[PDB]
Amino acid sequence: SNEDLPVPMENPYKEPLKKCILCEKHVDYKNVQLLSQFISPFTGCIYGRHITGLCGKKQKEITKAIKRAQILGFMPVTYKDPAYLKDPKVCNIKYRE
Amino acid sequence: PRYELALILKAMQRPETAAALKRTLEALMDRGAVVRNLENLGERMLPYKISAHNQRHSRGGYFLVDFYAPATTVESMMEHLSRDIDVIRPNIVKHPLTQEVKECEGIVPVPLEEKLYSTKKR
Amino acid sequence: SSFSIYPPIPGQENSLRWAGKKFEEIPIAHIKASYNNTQIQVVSAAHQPLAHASCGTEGFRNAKKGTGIAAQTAGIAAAAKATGKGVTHVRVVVKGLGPGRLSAIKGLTMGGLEVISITDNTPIPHXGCRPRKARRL
Amino acid sequence: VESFASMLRHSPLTQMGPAKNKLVIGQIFHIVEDDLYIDFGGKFHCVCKRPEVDGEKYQKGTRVRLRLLDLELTSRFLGATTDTTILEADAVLLGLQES
Amino acid sequence: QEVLQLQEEAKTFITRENLEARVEEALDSPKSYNWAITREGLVVRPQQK
Amino acid sequence: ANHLKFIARTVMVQEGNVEGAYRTLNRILTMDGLIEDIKRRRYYEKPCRRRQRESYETCRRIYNMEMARKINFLMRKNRADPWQGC
Amino acid sequence: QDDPPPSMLLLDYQNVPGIHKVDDVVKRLLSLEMANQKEKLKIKKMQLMNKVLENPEDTSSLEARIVALTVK
RNA sequence: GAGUUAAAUUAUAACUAAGCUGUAAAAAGCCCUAGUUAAAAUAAAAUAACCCACGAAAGUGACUCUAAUAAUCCUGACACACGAUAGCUAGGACCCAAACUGGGAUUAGAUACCCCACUAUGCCUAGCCCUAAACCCAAAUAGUUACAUAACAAAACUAU
Numbered sequence A: 001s002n003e004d005l006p007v008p009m010e011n012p013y014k015e016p017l018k019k020c021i022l023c024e025k026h027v028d029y030k031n032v033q034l035l036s037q038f039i040s041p042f043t044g045c046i047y048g049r050h051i052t053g054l055c056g057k058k059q060k061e062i063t064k065a066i067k068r069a070q071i072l073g074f075m076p077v078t079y080k081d082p083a084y085l086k087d088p089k090v091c092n093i094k095y096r097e
Numbered sequence B: 001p002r003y004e005l006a007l008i009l010k011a012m013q014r015p016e017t018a019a020a021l022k023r024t025l026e027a028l029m030d031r032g033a034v035v036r037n038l039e040n041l042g043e044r045m046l047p048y049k050i051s052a053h054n055q056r057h058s059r060g061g062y063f064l065v066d067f068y069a070p071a072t073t074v075e076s077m078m079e080h081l082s083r084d085i086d087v088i089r090p091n092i093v094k095h096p097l098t099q100e101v102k103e104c105e106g107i108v109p110v111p112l113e114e115k116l117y118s119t120k121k122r
Numbered sequence C: 001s002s003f004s005i006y007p008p009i010p011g012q013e014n015s016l017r018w019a020g021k022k023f024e025e026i027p028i029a030h031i032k033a034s035y036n037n038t039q040i041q042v043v044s045a046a047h048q049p050l051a052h053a054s055c056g057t058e059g060f061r062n063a064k065k066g067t068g069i070a071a072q073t074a075g076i077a078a079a080a081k082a083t084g085k086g087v088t089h090v091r092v093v094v095k096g097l098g099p100g101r102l103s104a105i106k107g108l109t110m111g112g113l114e115v116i117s118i119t120d121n122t123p124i125p126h127x128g129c130r131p132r133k134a135r136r137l
Numbered sequence D: 001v002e003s004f005a006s007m008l009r010h011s012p013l014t015q016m017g018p019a020k021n022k023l024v025i026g027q028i029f030h031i032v033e034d035d036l037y038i039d040f041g042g043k044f045h046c047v048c049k050r051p052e053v054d055g056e057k058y059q060k061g062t063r064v065r066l067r068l069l070d071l072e073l074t075s076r077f078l079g080a081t082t083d084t085t086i087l088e089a090d091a092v093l094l095g096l097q098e099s
Numbered sequence E: 001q002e003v004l005q006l007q008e009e010a011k012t013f014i015t016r017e018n019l020e021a022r023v024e025e026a027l028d029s030p031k032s033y034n035w036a037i038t039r040e041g042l043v044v045r046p047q048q049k
Numbered sequence F: 001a002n003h004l005k006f007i008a009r010t011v012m013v014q015e016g017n018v019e020g021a022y023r024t025l026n027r028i029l030t031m032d033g034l035i036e037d038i039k040r041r042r043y044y045e046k047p048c049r050r051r052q053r054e055s056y057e058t059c060r061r062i063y064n065m066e067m068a069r070k071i072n073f074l075m076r077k078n079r080a081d082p083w084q085g086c
Numbered sequence G: 001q002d003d004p005p006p007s008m009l010l011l012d013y014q015n016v017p018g019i020h021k022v023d024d025v026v027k028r029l030l031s032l033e034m035a036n037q038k039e040k041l042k043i044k045k046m047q048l049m050n051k052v053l054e055n056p057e058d059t060s061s062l063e064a065r066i067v068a069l070t071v072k
Numbered sequence H: 001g002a003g004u005u006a007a008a009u010u011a012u013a014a015c016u017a018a019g020c021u022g023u024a025a026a027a028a029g030c031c032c033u034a035g036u037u038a039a040a041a042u043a044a045a046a047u048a049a050c051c052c053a054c055g056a057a058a059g060u061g062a063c064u065c066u067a068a069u070a071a072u073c074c075u076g077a078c079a080c081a082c083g084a085u086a087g088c089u090a091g092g093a094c095c096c097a098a099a100c101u102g103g104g105a106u107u108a109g110a111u112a113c114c115c116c117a118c119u120a121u122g123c124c125u126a127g128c129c130c131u132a133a134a135c136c137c138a139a140a141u142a143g144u145u146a147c148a149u150a151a152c153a154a155a156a157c158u159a160u
């Protein structure tokens, strides 16, 4: 008879889960600019999750997309393409101190 | 589209470039392929020097061809382009639009795992 | 004073000339700093050698030539021979990792030679020849 | 006699909802040279540093404004059966209470 | 629905009749797929240059 | 060998100093892990050792990054005790 | 052993009406010429069960599963 | 299965230099060498990977395409199929690493650790051999958190 007892309902304050940078977006091996932002400009290495910040699905796709462009002849391997050196920075690594 | 042809051609003038595409598209049709469209990516400096047919190439034009073809004729198309000398590096991949972008919900946070050791006094 | 670490790309036109010549016209100083020897060679923009110097040629012998001081002396001697042919600025390329990397870099500076750009070209195989086995010292 | 269930429904704590980003006023009950122990009505007491402006009027019993972030700081570390509490609360100073 | 869109898409397919026209048209209309991404997830199109 | 020269792993000096520029180059290589990679490629390690090395590097990285969080989490509990001699 | 005809519409694009009125280009795109081995198995399985099984709509029956294994 | 090659290395050519490799320190070896520039074949697959996926296991992480991962979803051998690495038989490849062997050094001796050279072989095609700390030392299928700490470790237990 007591209406003050709590009801068995889900949490109404569940904030939506965080979206990665490339969530709901289609990666490709033809757009060099998108792939080049995740490559160290001085060396040409590929950043990991702790630097890129992407989720578990788009990190593998970027890795496969980049390597496809390495062999098919669309982007340099040992360095970042200088034409896309002024693109906005998305990684969290800083070299200059 | 079903197949995509990552075609890179040696840099040359307008007439022979059109001729090279004309016979390349003819070769695809002879193997039983219905080409959808031709996309031009312009001429760009190659990322690195590529050796093909006893030549060192630094500049070339990029072209993209998408078509529907039987699975058994992919080897014939690749072999034919290998003997052609006006193409520097041909490659065939499945068209990316064939696969659908899988729906995503978010980055699910993984809680730290417990109960990995006994509760005895260390 | 906006200064960019990245080198001036040859495709573009950067108004940054040293001694009246462009970036690519400046000669090159190749430095091979091995674990037992350091070899220094300066070549022109057309890859024509100008002067050569190494720890062995400067009187150091055996284990002595692998020390930093031996590489430091080689840089002074190499710069002195290079400056005789009339070169002021040079782009230094470092090959390999060794004890003589720092000494050779500052050896050229104190030898009357000025450097403007540093490049590391250590041979890094990507999977390549199988190296030698371990040493159970 | 009022049932305990009704008390929780109308209690200010329940009406607050999530503790993150909530403007809650509190009263200072202890003063150190640079630390202000503030009770905002929660289970524990938050600690804040005296601001450089109007710092001389922050005395015992003074009311201030706070922005609660976590009601009770508590985390889990590997190898710990039970979480290690801090016995404090996290909050920031927005100024003094405007009487 | 799937066969209906292929019915319309069949009109623009390249045949031997219009082999020359499509080649000539392609060589005069370059296009690129390049586009950058920002921290917040907004798409930046380099075509604005 | 096929790529353009004087683009990758290259820095330029400023104001005429070379010691500062060289240290900047070393930080770039150390961050990208090339310095340790060259050290491990002087000799060859069997694949048995490679997995044993990555099972110790990963364990250290978990323990170090977990102890570090507790240090920062408990860092605020270092003020002078207000109840001394209570 | 069975040999499905090449110029046949695949399993999905058969019961939809208005196919024979379409030009040869679209019919070519839907035939087995532009279909991989996976689509070929569907045609073989569909035809095989319609010749030996009594009730094709029943899948949990033992006879239906034996036909499916025989195709593989 | 089929096709393909980025980074390194080597045959080889040009130029300069007289020395080059090597160690805690040396000797031997090389001087047909070393540095730079240009460059096949063979072999091996940086960063991604702080990810933990696929396969029955042993295993697999350079790229592309084709074929493709049993069972309407229990247990089961001495039967059928498979099984890293080393080893054998025949043909082909050989950058580089390298048991054996020779030389140098160390030592009372060193047919060992250290240094230099090179072979089997590691590789491709066809066949055989069927062994591992083949170990996550924890058998398969369903479950329970009740009862209850030999020790140690990766908590305890029930049913077929």
Ligand code: FES
Residues within 6 Å of the ligand: A018, A019, A020, A021, A022, A023, A024, A054, A055, A056, A057, A058, B104, B105, B106, B107
């Ligand atoms: S979180 Fe949705 S794809 Fe990354």
Ligand SMILES: [K+]
Residues within 6 Å of the ligand: C126, C127, H045, H062
């Ligand atoms: K590789």
Ligand SMILES: [Mg+2]
Residues within 6 Å of the ligand: F001
């Ligand atoms: Mg090469």
Ligand SMILES: [Mg+2]
Residues within 6 Å of the ligand: H011
């Ligand atoms: Mg040979």
Ligand SMILES: [Mg+2]
Residues within 6 Å of the ligand: none
């Ligand atoms: Mg001698």
Ligand SMILES: [Mg+2]
Residues within 6 Å of the ligand: none
């Ligand atoms: Mg030589």
Ligand SMILES: [Mg+2]
Residues within 6 Å of the ligand: H052
């Ligand atoms: Mg693994």
Ligand SMILES: [Mg+2]
Residues within 6 Å of the ligand: H056
């Ligand atoms: Mg199984």
Ligand SMILES: [Mg+2]
Residues within 6 Å of the ligand: none
């Ligand atoms: Mg299965």
Ligand SMILES: [Mg+2]
Residues within 6 Å of the ligand: H076
């Ligand atoms: Mg059984």
Ligand SMILES: [Mg+2]
Residues within 6 Å of the ligand: none
């Ligand atoms: Mg075997």
Ligand SMILES: [Mg+2]
Residues within 6 Å of the ligand: none
């Ligand atoms: Mg074997």
Ligand SMILES: [Mg+2]
Residues within 6 Å of the ligand: none
């Ligand atoms: Mg063998």
Ligand SMILES: [Mg+2]
Residues within 6 Å of the ligand: H088
């Ligand atoms: Mg025998």
Ligand SMILES: [Mg+2]
Residues within 6 Å of the ligand: none
């Ligand atoms: Mg043999």
Ligand SMILES: [Mg+2]
Residues within 6 Å of the ligand: H094
């Ligand atoms: Mg041999």
